[PDB]
């Protein structure tokens, strides 16, 4: 039997900003020179990442450790965003939170000093050849057992009365789970919303039903939407090549893009035993899942409407290159059976797709071209696979 899907090139959705991951040379080892190239180049055997995330150290004597990786990322065409975990210690005080004592927050009398600390980091990185794309108010203000807590109202006061002085695009609030209570106050206050440039969110435990954001569709004109940190489905030691488990990475990216309208998807540590690049410097199954998007859906491409679930266990997304109206379709098949789909692309002059396939036994393998019959491309997806058509 034969399933169907339609890609509508005239129904444009979000512009793609890019894909990438975290570097943190204070908590773990920096990327090496060769690993910087594997991450940020887009040749064969490279990931094609176009976003680097870094941390803003509370101790300025550590800032120089960021520079070499961030410079090489930019030279290879990536953008850089930075997130703080704590303010300098002289700006912090303690409080008791839900009966747990000794918890950290920014002193209310130090909000202006904290603006200056962020600006000092921006200017230091600029002096060193790293013009940051954006800087965040706080990493996970709502999951801060091990760092600095901010309530929705503390975040709001900072966004409204201080964030306009930051000499960079401002990212907020980076909830651990995209909890809307952290961001609704910013969207609902005209001055706080003016001082926002990127709505940042993490995805830990975020379900599909919680990926849409009606208030952001209503009030978010001119603001970018980025998923700035996750790992999925777990951080188990030495898990990065497990199959078919790695398919959950692809699915979570599909869901960010299509269910959440996200413009960016950013992993936690780039190099790690559960990450996209293994400790031996080679790409993991989880990394190939990312690569099906990152190598092909380049910054400035625009997502378009496409049948998202054409048959059980099959998931489709499509993005268009506005330079020539060509399309990139990424199709996941979680079934133990092969699936054949007629994909209609009305109004296209394109008549041939190339395809790259990942299964448990091959990585980004170039398979036989698809020749269209008129504007319909009939494709067959191997069981337990991801295919990118270009």
């Amino acid at each position: 039997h034969m399933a169907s899907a339609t890609i509508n090139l005239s129904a444009e959705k979000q512009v793609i900003r890019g894909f990438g991951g975290m570097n943190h040379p204070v908590w773990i080892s920096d990327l090496t020179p060769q690993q910087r190239d594997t991450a940020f180049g887009n040749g064969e055997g490279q990931l094609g990442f176009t976003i680097l995330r870094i941390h803003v150290d509370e101790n300025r004597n550590n800032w120089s450790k960021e520079v070499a990786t961030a410079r090489r990322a930019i030279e290879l065409g990536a953008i850089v965003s930075a997130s703080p975990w704590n303010p300098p210690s002289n700006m912090v005080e303690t409080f008791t939170r839900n009966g747990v004592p000794n918890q950290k927050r920014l002193r209310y009398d130090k909000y202006g000093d904290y603006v200056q600390h962020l600006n000092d980091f921006v200017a230091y990185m600029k002096s060193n050849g790293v013009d940051l794309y954006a800087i965040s108010v706080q990493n996970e203000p709502d999951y801060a057992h091990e760092w600095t807590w901010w309530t929705p109202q503390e975040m709001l006061r900072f966004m409204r009365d201080y964030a306009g002085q930051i000499n960079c695009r401002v990212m907020a609030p980076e909830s651990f789970q995209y909890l809307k209570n952290m961001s609704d106050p910013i969207l609902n206050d005209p001055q706080a919303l003016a001082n926002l440039d990127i709505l940042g969110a993490h995805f830990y435990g975020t379900t599909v039903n919680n990926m849409p954001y009606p208030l952001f569709e209503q009030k978010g004109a001119g603001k970018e939407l980025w998923m700035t940190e996750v790992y999925v489905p777990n951080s188990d030691s030495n898990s990065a090549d497990r199959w078919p488990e790695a398919l959950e990475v692809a699915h979570n990216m599909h869901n960010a893009l299509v269910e959440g309208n996200f413009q960016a998807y950013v992993w936690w540590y780039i190099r790690r035993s559960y990450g996209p690049m293994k400790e031996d410097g080679t790409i993991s199954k989880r990394g190939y899942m990312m690569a099906h998007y990152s190598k092909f859906v380049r910054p400035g491409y625009v997502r378009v409407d496409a049948t998202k679930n054409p048959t059980y266990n099959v998931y489709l997304s499509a993005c268009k290159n506005k330079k020539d109206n060509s399309v990139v379709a990424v199709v996941i098949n979680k079934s133990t059976e092969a699936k054949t789909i007629n994909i209609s692309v009305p109004g296209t002059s394109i008549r041939k797709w190339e395809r790259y396939v990942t299964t448990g036994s091959k990585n980004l393998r170039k398979e036989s071209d698809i020749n269209a019959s008129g504007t319909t491309f009939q494709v067959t997806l191997e069981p337990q696979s991801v295919t990118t058509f270009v």
Binding site: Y143, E146, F176, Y204, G205, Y231, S235
Partner: peptide, 4 residues
């Protein structure tokens, strides 16, 4: 749940 995470980073723990």
């Amino acid at each position: 749940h995470h980073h723990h």
